[PDB]
Design an enzyme around this catalytic site. Sequence first.
Site, PDB file in Angstrom:
ATOM      1  N   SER A 112       3.764   0.923   2.728  1.00 55.11           N
ATOM      2  CA  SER A 112       5.042   0.458   2.122  1.00 55.11           C
ATOM      3  C   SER A 112       5.676   1.586   1.309  1.00 55.11           C
ATOM      4  CB  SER A 112       4.835  -0.753   1.252  1.00 55.11           C
ATOM      5  OG  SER A 112       3.960  -1.676   1.874  1.00 55.11           O
ATOM      6  N   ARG A 160      -3.607  -2.152  -5.339  1.00 54.54           N
ATOM      7  CA  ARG A 160      -3.136  -3.560  -5.278  1.00 54.54           C
ATOM      8  C   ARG A 160      -3.253  -4.064  -3.832  1.00 54.54           C
ATOM      9  NH1 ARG A 160       2.737  -4.855  -7.792  1.00 54.54           N
ATOM     10  NH2 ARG A 160       1.388  -5.284  -9.594  1.00 54.54           N
ATOM     11  N   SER A 175       2.447  -1.715  -3.258  1.00 59.24           N
ATOM     12  CA  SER A 175       1.635  -0.714  -4.002  1.00 59.24           C
ATOM     13  C   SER A 175       1.678  -1.052  -5.491  1.00 59.24           C
ATOM     14  CB  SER A 175       2.126   0.695  -3.775  1.00 59.24           C
ATOM     15  OG  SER A 175       2.519   0.902  -2.426  1.00 59.24           O
ATOM     16  N   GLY A 232      -1.663  -0.811   6.100  1.00 57.99           N
ATOM     17  CA  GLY A 232      -1.600  -1.838   7.153  1.00 57.99           C
ATOM     18  C   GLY A 232      -2.649  -2.917   6.928  1.00 57.99           C
ATOM     19  N   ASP A 284       7.854   0.645  -5.265  1.00 55.91           N
ATOM     20  CA  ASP A 284       7.540  -0.358  -4.205  1.00 55.91           C
ATOM     21  C   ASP A 284       6.693  -1.491  -4.796  1.00 55.91           C
ATOM     22  OD1 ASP A 284       6.513  -1.455  -1.421  1.00 55.91           O
ATOM     23  OD2 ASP A 284       4.749  -0.442  -2.253  1.00 55.91           O
ATOM     24  N   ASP A 325      -2.905   3.734  -4.055  1.00 54.49           N
ATOM     25  CA  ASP A 325      -2.787   2.574  -4.967  1.00 54.49           C
ATOM     26  C   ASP A 325      -4.095   1.776  -4.877  1.00 54.49           C
ATOM     27  OD1 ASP A 325      -2.090   1.653  -2.233  1.00 54.49           O
ATOM     28  OD2 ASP A 325      -1.801  -0.284  -3.256  1.00 54.49           O
ATOM     29  N   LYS A 383      -9.070   1.739  -1.523  1.00 59.22           N
ATOM     30  CA  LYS A 383      -8.392   1.954  -0.221  1.00 59.22           C
ATOM     31  C   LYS A 383      -8.863   3.266   0.408  1.00 59.22           C
ATOM     32  CE  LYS A 383      -4.571  -1.178  -0.657  1.00 59.22           C
ATOM     33  NZ  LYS A 383      -3.309  -1.459  -1.381  1.00 59.22           N
ATOM     34  N   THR A 412       0.864  -1.216   0.000  1.00 58.77           N
ATOM     35  CA  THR A 412       0.000   0.000   0.000  1.00 58.77           C
ATOM     36  C   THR A 412       0.887   1.249   0.000  1.00 58.77           C
ATOM     37  OG1 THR A 412      -1.523  -1.287   1.362  1.00 58.77           O
ATOM     38  CG2 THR A 412      -2.054   1.056   1.096  1.00 58.77           C
TER      39      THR A 412
END
Lengths: 218, 219, 204, 206, 206, 229, 229, 202, 214
Positions: free
Chosen positions: B129, B19, B169, B47, B166, B17, B33, B1
């Site tokens: 992340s 994913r 994400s 988280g 990252d 993001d 999200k 994330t």
Amino acid sequence: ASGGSVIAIKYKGGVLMAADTLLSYGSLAKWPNIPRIRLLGSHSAVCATGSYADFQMMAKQVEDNIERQKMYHNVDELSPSEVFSYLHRSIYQKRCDFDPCLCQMVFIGVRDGETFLAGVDDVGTRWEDDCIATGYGAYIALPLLRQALEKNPDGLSRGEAMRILTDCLRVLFYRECRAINKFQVADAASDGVRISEPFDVETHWEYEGYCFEKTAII
Amino acid sequence: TTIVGVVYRDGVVLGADTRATEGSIVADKRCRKIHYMAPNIMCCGAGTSADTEAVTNMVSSHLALHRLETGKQSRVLEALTLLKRHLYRYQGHVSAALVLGGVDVEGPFLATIAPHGSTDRLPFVTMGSGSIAAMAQLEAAYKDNMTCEEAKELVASAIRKGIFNDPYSGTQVDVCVITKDKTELTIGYDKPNERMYPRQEVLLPPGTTPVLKEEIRQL
Amino acid sequence: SIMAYSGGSVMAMAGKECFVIISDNRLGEQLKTISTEVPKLHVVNDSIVYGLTGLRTDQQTFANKVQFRTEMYKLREERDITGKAFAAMITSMLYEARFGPWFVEPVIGSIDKSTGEVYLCATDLIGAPCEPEDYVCAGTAAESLHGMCEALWRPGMSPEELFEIAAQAMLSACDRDSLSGYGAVAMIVTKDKVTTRLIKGRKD
Amino acid sequence: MAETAIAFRCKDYVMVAAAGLNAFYYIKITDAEDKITQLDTHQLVACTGENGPRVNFTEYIKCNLALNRMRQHGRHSSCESTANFMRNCLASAIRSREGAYQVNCLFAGYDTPVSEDDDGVVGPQLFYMDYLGTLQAVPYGCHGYGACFVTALLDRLWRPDLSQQEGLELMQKCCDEVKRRVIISNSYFFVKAVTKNGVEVITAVH
Amino acid sequence: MAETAIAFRCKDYVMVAAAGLNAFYYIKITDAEDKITQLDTHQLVACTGENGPRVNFTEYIKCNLALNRMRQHGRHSSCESTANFMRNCLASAIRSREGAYQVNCLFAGYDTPVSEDDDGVVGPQLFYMDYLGTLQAVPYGCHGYGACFVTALLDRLWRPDLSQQEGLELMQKCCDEVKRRVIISNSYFFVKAVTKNGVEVITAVH
Amino acid sequence: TTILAVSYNGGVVLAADSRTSSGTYVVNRASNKLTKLTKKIYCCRSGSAADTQALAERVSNYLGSYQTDIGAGVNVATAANLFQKMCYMNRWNISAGIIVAGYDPINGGSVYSIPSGGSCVKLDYALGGSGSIFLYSFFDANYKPGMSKSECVAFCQRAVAHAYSRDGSSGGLIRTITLDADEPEDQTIPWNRSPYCMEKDPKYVTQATQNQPFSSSAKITGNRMSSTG
Amino acid sequence: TTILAVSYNGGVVLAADSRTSSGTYVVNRASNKLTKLTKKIYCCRSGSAADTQALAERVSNYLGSYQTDIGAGVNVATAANLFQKMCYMNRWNISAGIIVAGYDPINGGSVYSIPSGGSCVKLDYALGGSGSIFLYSFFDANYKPGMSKSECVAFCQRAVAHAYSRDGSSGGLIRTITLDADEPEDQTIPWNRSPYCMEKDPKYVTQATQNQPFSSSAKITGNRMSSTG
Amino acid sequence: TTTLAFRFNGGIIVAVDSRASTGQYIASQTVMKVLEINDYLLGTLAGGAADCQYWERVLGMECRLWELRNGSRITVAAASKILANITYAYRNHGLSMGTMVAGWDQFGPSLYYVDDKGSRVKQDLFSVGSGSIYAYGVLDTGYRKDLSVEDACDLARRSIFHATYRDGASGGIVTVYHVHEKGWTKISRDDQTKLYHRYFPS
Amino acid sequence: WSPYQDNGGTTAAIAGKDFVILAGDTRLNGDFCLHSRHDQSKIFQLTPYTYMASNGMQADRLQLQQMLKYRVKWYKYNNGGKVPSTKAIAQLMSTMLYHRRFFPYYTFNMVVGLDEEGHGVCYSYDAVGSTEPFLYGTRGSAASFVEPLLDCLINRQHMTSQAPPEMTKEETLAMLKNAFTGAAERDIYTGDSVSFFIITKDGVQQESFELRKD
């Protein structure tokens, strides 16, 4: 005593590398006047995040091996590609003794137009690319550097590649704990590497959201 | 994330993001999200996806119930304080890393609630992340009194750092503009990761897979 | 791993006005097999089928709970529970034990009998719903099934097409998983009719 | 693991077999401890764990089933029932302060029609149960070191249709396979079969 | 510990007995592995550990004794000797990189007068040896789970003066006590006695 | 974290860095560590942001209730003794190093260090947080009690800077606040205009002579800065 | 342990506390931590006394052999690079934090920090040992390079004092030594006459108001000092 | 893994499965588990595939070198004993290799289980790997010493098959070998799912 | 400090009757970031006909790569010029992974190429040195995502449908493109580009192919 974070980025006919002039014994910012970017022979620079001790030994052993091979036998100096291969094996050999060179090196250098930029890890993990970072640079600055290489896909100019470092260095300074606002920049071009006099960056701290009354818990 | 907020002149812009991972797998490419807390308050969550969803809902509920009692738009400070006191009571075991944006009477409000119950009311924030990569793009480009257009294009840029630089994400940037009057949730504001190579339709004709027994039931 | 103990895999898959949910048949303790006739699907009502994967104890316990809760719904509410609700009810039940969880990963297929829109949900063990358009999976073959389903699956498929790729998916994954296989029981739900198929696979 | 329970289900009987071995560390006390308790006229449970949890669980079931037969005016509950009751009790236990009853049951019975109106399973019912509460209906199961020798030997020989007589021959081979192949001296086996008529204690096999 | 060796020494013979049980974890492979190696005409060693160290230690001794009989022109070394050589080898091993030979020996022999001039012990010699190198001359010894059952049963019955015939009756009771009382199925026992005449393999007892 | 109260004649000055790090990454750059309990009674917060914030709010609530019912101002003592009890009860669970400073009309400018253990030590001046450890010597030398309000602020800024310049954990803005008879004066010195920093200090301009060219002479010159030289 | 070299124009001053503690008990009260390698090149020693003494003697021996065979003085560099190699080879086994300072005629007054890792950093001034951490801020404030030999000594003493007054590990005598063109001047400031100590500082005379009598008034007075009052 | 050999009048059967599973995921479903060393020696690999494939190939070098030096084939006794002395020297080097060296030499057929810990056992019947316990079940039922070569392979193939059917780590393809006075021959190479539809036709 | 660092990525090989396709992704990912998107180190040429794809730790793949080249380069001198076959190098890989089994190369290799007939062949290893010849195979992050797909589309085990004719060089490539595309979309640690090496009798022909950037 540990080094902060290096960033380096290829431009047209050269490489820029940049690094805080700070060694940090744990939390404590011990020395703010350390030149962390070293020149390896006539063509190349090096610089390391991590144990300045284990870098001081590796950068010594390499800079010897160059100026020996050159002075002893009547040969051309080693190309950056070679110097860096020697650094890479020297580091891999030390992780294979469980006595590691416990430091991520960035490495820049330019022979002719032949422009070379690489990282290496504690364990020997080696990677060429058009932009490198070590330490926090990798999590912070690399994203911005990669964005500035995607956007100028023909290649950056030395003025553009300097402004994009200065942008990353400002952000490293804000966000990395063990940094200071006093950087040097190595510049590999055809003539060889030049390390800049230490410079600071302009920093913006007077946002209206950073005022006292807004950030107050109560 | 990676999720992001910025304060612009009129209100807030959140970003995420999409994913949603299980370990080193993409369970869902397009998951949302940016949850509804209230009409004037959105709440991005990084988280543990369970904890982010449960905390968020529990409060969005509490707020909605309180929004009847009062007969008043829910204040962002109220929502914040409910996420704090809840997340603090569980010593961060409830591993919900929230960015709570909204706009009350007082003006644009944008906080982070870190899992332990820490709160940082700020002008621009990140969590998850990809946070660090995003916070780079945000620290570089953010300036005070942005327009809604500048502020979306920034947030999108900042997510796109987390998305590429990252693993956890990925996919597309959801962006949400909370202004004083309304809440525009643009899903796929930016699709950087389109389709590379079109799907090679393998044709398995009916009666391929061998079937020992069958039972049809009509309705 | 406590999830991988009893073994099993489940997979659901959305087509046009139909979904195919499909389990394996194995029940194990670690590597040793108990039974090869243990399908992991349960049927709540006409329009909802959910597989449970993980520790079999809890598959069976948490199943008896879901059955108690979806019967108490059917009496009090005087109507069959809808996918949406049922999946969100399950997240609430799983999250009720955030600390001390049920070692179960409910895959839920569902289809609104009026609209004909499919709803899938693959809840993790603490009720983290993942509700994609396409397909969902869980259990030991989960890595392998995502690989299969991703290649084979196209949008607007018809019940028969779908089953043949849902079956090939579940099988060609359970070949590469120790803790799943002994065929598979698929279940092809449409607004119209519910086709339960027992598929022949390996004996491994 | 020390003490091997075997059971298998055919057309018109379940056969159950359980080690006699009563052990204190590495010491054979005796080879004559009956581990197959009788919960009903038509229902018995080859429990194999440490004596404490084995007894305190097979007693708790045996009482709470007798207590049901009282409150339900002599009505003999189905096998599906007690099996699901046993497992619900075993499962309840892995999330209490006590911890799991550490007992591996092979629950076996024979559902007879309880009145005129009964439409349910007539015939024999075998269930395998882990200590955790993994209930599962099976044709044949086992617990203990010997299990996996017998489980494969049954895969080979067991058909669903063999006599009461071919079940003695088979259960002898299952018992004799645990004797040949397991170090732990499971040297006498209590074998009890369930039929329509009730529980009978097979003395022929051991 | 799984595999019980028993030995006892009387007026004019040593009797030795060793488990046949060859085990892989909890699986009886066989009950017919002779663990009593013969080091000489008149000397044998009931070794009981894991097969690897048992063989590589009883071979090393059996070779280094044969090697001594070559270099000493057919001279048959005393029991005191080989016992002290075996222990000196076992002891050397607990302070090497290899680690201890993990083998519990009951070394037994019968010293005969080797020439006219021999004044030394005539008669039978039994020595208990730990894996560490604790050598000790004894009337009777044991190794394995069964040891302490036999050790006490011998305390009771064993006298120094019983026949070859009362030694079969006793060694049967010592073997039968390990069968009754140890879970680990030590179900066949190789029994070999040493006399003046040599090693004889007692088939009667098992 | 670097925090410090000092008392001048009339009242007190709190001063703080504005950096909360998750170790080596700076999560927030501009945290207010000075947290209002009442009008005139601010606490500084070292250690876990969560735990000090939860305690600052829990105490700011009781002082609010108290202040209402007694129908008068709160004594700083009261704030510090409430904050001691809550820091003490939980001393094992939390990681909280507090300074309650403030003004009441009875005692004037009071400062209480409540470190980890839940001790509570009325002082002339308290230092908290990682970057305290640097200041202790700096105070012993340059602190001189009986300062004017103006100097005590200019000092505390100078101090917080000397600390955040050496400490990694500490850095950013130097928030102060003066609490006396008059209305609370907060001011936020941004880093770019801080009173001290190692970067701009002429001591540390001239670089360490580490690199050093390949020479024919033990005579140390400077660093090697060109490949051509 | 507190140690520090500083360079003045001609040469250097090393300075040290004199206390070696086994944690909380003071084993030796009067240790010489300044350890002669050559006539004019002293090393300071922080960390395990065993390990720094063994290294100081091992190096003092190679410098002796070297000094003989080259038939000339030793460059301080040579002392520091020898000390770096030995601190680096064993960096895992030992716990040694060295400062080689000295005078050679070529470079003049040189100072090398060799901390734990076996880095080796030529500096204007080096701080070592537990009690270093206190000085860093004290130097950043009060140090002002281009001091006279006299001031640099009077300063280093003042420094070592401010450190040993706050650090537990550090304490006792303040040994200095000046290494320049002239003959080495060691002096040993005994604690009873140290330049700074918290005990004698008028800042800390007035006690914290902790005890405080049972009163009918929130007005803090002083501590309770008589049972009669 | 499942891997069983046994001795009878006709000679020695060696049967194996053909799967190498890392606990949950299955790497390969085609691992050749009967190592063919000499043309009168069959090593079987079970445990650490790496250690067997290496050491049983070393054994193969030492067996061939013996054939050159001593102008005559090694015994199986000595072949196993070589392997046993290599595994003994490496017992506390964390090897993992339950092997079976089967063969026919001057002194009849000989089967030897050889462990990681230097163990070396003359077996008449034996099974190694996760599914051994299952094989032994079936195998101790039908096993006499007077089987025909047909019934011996029938028995072994079933035995491996019934391990494949139960063990998750055992599966794939049920290879059988025979070891006779003329060397070894690969009898069959049956897939274990085709085998289920032979042995249980309904 | 761990001397091992999984540098991620996925390698696949498929052997036809004339050729081998050999794929290895170009993502070299360190600790929570990524170092490069154009890392070619995964695959390495030993001879014209024989390639060694290698996963896990880069540093070790690169040591082994050299170590293997300098035993190939020795074999060239000792066996007068003659290059080693694939089958030789394959056993050499197993032999050289094992000599280092008491401090293993953390590298899951595949030696791929042509045998003496011209029939394409691939061998796989584990860190310790366990040779298994396979026909289609996949080590790495996306082992689990690719290897079931190939298992379905090559062997057609669970299909009533008649097995497809053979599978040409271009179809097997088109299959692998599709597989990796479906592994980049579903695995996090696979992405950026994939280097394909199509070894035939004629010589190698490499064509890099683009994936999802994330």
